[PDB]
């Protein structure tokens, strides 16, 4: 509730996926109500549904009320009961174990420039079959793992992987009437350098083989298309998911009855 999305989903059918990748374009989207709003782009690696839902989450987030500033920051999240009483951001609760401190969890990232310099958050996650732990690698460098000890439905692998943007509307319009930007703050039709994207839309099967689904095998979700949208774009070497938008204007208030 009060969350809005522009994401794609890969439903595998059974909880057997042994990992996934996400190369996420980094931006510093503006927030209409920064004291409560957030804007992020991430991967969701999951198994189950309802209270049995288990997540492995990683990406960037502009959340001033949590991080202290408007910079996009590397964040992680997990849940083992579909967000009722388990899971937390970064290392705020026992769950994720950091083994390599080369990268800081929560590190401020360099935002991309509109029509200019493009930056990328390359994150790779893979389950270790000998333990059930899910390891995180940022730009090839190991960070740590989500232990199998905190999970139930995802202990043997994931059934669903999702990528894309999400905003959190603290104004209570449901994400339907807030100029809190998603991605770059521009609609995906703008393309490279102007609209944000997610590439390396890959996941791993039980045999360690990378699955790179085509646009045909992904389910697009964007319940507020006037505010935030998604768009596949075939690049020279791989499929791109463009996503985001400027948000929507407030509901017209032209009454002036005395
Ligand atoms: C896109 O996503 C793919 C995901 O697969 C990325 O490529 C892979 O990245 C990971 C992480 O960097 C690499 O993992 C490492 O693999 C090595 C080698 O593993 C092989 O050899 C082992 C023996 O030396 C063997 O045990 C392994 O076999 C097991 O797993 C296979 C699954 O393929 C299964 O079939 C077998 O039955 C076995 O159970 C395997 O053949 C491994 O040694 C590394 O281990 C270190 O890290 C782990 C934690 O992650 C830790 O537990 C270990 O103790 C150790 O410290 C590690 O797992 C993988 O090799 C890459 N694959 C390829 C083909 O390159 C890719 O990088 C992503 N791209 C982007 C852009 O993000
Ligand atoms: C799980 O999914 C894989 C891939 O579709 C399939 O081959 C396998 O038979 C499924 N069933 C079981 C019991 O794992």
Author numbering: 132 to 380, 401 to 409
In the authors' words:
The final refined model of the derivative complex was used to solve the native pro-neprosin structure by molecular replacement. Moreover, mature neprosin produced two different monoclinic crystal forms, I and II, whose structures were likewise solved by molecular replacement. The structure of mature neprosin crystal form I proved practically identical to the equivalent part of the zymogen, with a core root mean square deviation (RMSD) of 0.62 Å. The only significant difference was encountered at N232–Y233, which is folded outward in the zymogen to accommodate I103 at the beginning of the rightmost strand of the PD. Moreover, in the structures of mature neprosin crystal forms I and II, the C-terminal segment, which spanned an alanine–isoleucine–alanine tripeptide followed by the His6-tag, ran along the surface of a symmetry mate, thus mimicking a product complex. Both crystal forms were monoclinic but with different cell constants, which resulted in variable crystal packing. Indeed, we found a striking pair of glutamate residues (E188 and E297) bridged by a solvent molecule pinching the bound peptides in the product complexes. Our results suggest that the mature neprosin structures mimic upstream product complexes collectively occupying subsites S6 to S1′, with the two catalytic glutamates plus the bridging solvent molecule poised for reaction.
Here, we produce recombinant neprosin and its mutants, and find that full-length neprosin is a zymogen, which is self-activated at gastric pH by the release of an all-β pro-domain via a pH-switch mechanism featuring a lysine plug. The catalytic domain is an atypical 7+8-stranded β-sandwich with an extended active-site cleft containing an unprecedented pair of catalytic glutamates. Neprosin efficiently degrades both gliadin and the 33-mer in vitro under gastric conditions and is reversibly inactivated at pH > 5.
